[PDB]
Design a protein around this ligand. Sequence first.
Ligand SMILES: C[C@](O)(c1ccc(-c2ccc(S(=O)(=O)c3ccc(N)nc3)cc2)cc1)C(F)(F)F
Ligand SMILES: O=P(O)(O)OC[C@@H](O)[C@@H](O)[C@H](O)[C@@H](O)CO
Length: 585
Amino acid sequence: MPGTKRFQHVIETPEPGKWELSGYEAAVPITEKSNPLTQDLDKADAENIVRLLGQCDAEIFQEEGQSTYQRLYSESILTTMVQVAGKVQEVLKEPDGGLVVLSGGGTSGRMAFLMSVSFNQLMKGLGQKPLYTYLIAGGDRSVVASREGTEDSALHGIEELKKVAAGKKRVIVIGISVGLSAPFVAGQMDCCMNNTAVFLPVLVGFNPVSMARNDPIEDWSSTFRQVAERMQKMQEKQKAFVLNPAIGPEGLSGSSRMKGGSATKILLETLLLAAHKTVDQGIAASQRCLLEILRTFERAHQVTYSQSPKIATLMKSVSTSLEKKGHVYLVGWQTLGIIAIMDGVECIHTFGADFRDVRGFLIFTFSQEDFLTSILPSLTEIDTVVFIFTLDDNLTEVQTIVEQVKEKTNHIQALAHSTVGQTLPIPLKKLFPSIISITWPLLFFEYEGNFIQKFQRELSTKWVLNTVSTGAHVLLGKILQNHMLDLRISNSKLFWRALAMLQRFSGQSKARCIESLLRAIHFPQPLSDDIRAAPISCHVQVAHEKEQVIPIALLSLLFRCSITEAQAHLAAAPSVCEAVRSALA
Ligand SMILES: C[C@](O)(c1ccc(-c2ccc(S(=O)(=O)c3ccc(N)nc3)cc2)cc1)C(F)(F)F
Ligand SMILES: O=P(O)(O)OC[C@@H](O)[C@@H](O)[C@H](O)[C@@H](O)CO
């Protein structure tokens, strides 16, 4: 019937109590699963939230149990890292006409960008031509914007890839998609396999290939799953690689910007840095070199969450200022500035939040005086401003701006990275009472810009900011158990996530859930056979423009009522969240 094929890959809602034994659960990709640790994240206070997310992050480093999924420290994965470092070396010997592309959508694209800069700095420092570039769904602008809609085209991915691979002779394309999901990446990987002379694809994500996305892509014939099964067959001959350790579900379900983006850096910085540092030594990359780097990243998690209490306190002050209706400013220097802007932007699509609600700044790129002149005026009693820097930064630029803001704010906390035995200028630097000092043991780096120290700090800041931004919103009651129910449908994945969430919270059939969602999306237009059979992109395009799509659809299901009736009830309620939670009860 109309729509059957569009919706075929969707599994039926299991009966009450049979969610386990249906094996609906067994087919939910790890990246989409509910994390058991965060069952009650919506009831944790600020310190528990910090404890719970630090613990979810720790799962990146958990080793394989004895019939189960390969993980970061499993031998098959590390061996694949080794072989990939190998192939990157080949290109580093023959830079002429060589290129290395790091590509993803959303946060995968963001992570790509940072890494491409770093390894370009590193080749610069050695006086070598930069060989890295990045690709991101929707073009360069996407690096620092909420543009969730742009990942759904495989021709787009391929076009970007063809632009940059210009007239190169040897191209490594590292397609990153946490969910093994983005059609932007799938097209690149497939195109690489049709020209193996030139291209070597390397696919990075965090699901087993058996769980890779398998619904049709609108502008492409193969599914991500097919593309990844075929890359895996090519790996036996070293013409493709799939690098896909499980890292366990996200603490906020399906929020792959968190563990996923972190694991992307951990995994790729490790491997790229091993490759570089072993070419000039005339020595193959080896498990042992990678391990050293992985264990350093693992210490970085411990070190970072040593500051949990003060992490929780920044949480409380970010949530407060949002709860009144203030804004939160994230002020950082060099690469940590960039990461700040990335965090704030991601809050737009992740929590429905305004661009002003949690925004980042680099010294979006506003110089010292420029920030003092334009932004400084807009501050208020109830706002919160966060300073993020190292002791290597230019602390006269720092303290100035802090001085200025201190008058207008009072809620300022800060995030400071030091090697042990560095001190804070002004012992009266008690402009910040009780800082989040994060102090890094001395380590034996040998490259000029000390790249291992940069990656540690970036990763640690990422974790802090991710945990704060995410925690501040959970405190406001915007998250249900460990799901963001009220998201904005802006791509096909988000559309499947919504339908999934409707089945889980209603317990009602697939067909009912699908019908409610399409009615909520296209109201006031009734369901027609065309709408039922339309490409998912049609539903996305319409839903992306509306508010409360998913809650309305869930209310209509729970009260077994019309869309007209569910909107009226929502408008009659004190808030979306209360309407939903009391309807659930
Ligand atoms: C955990 C939960 O059941 C759930 C179950 C499934 C999904 C989900 C399942 C599949 C998709 S998807 O976009 O089709 C997809 C995405 C990635 C992938 N590798 N495979 C499929 C998106 C979301 C999301 C959530 C619920 F409780 F949240 F509903
Ligand atoms: O890396 P994937 O699975 O291809 O996901 C790509 C993007 O959808 C994803 O990073 C999204 O922007 C984030 O908001 C999810 O937290």
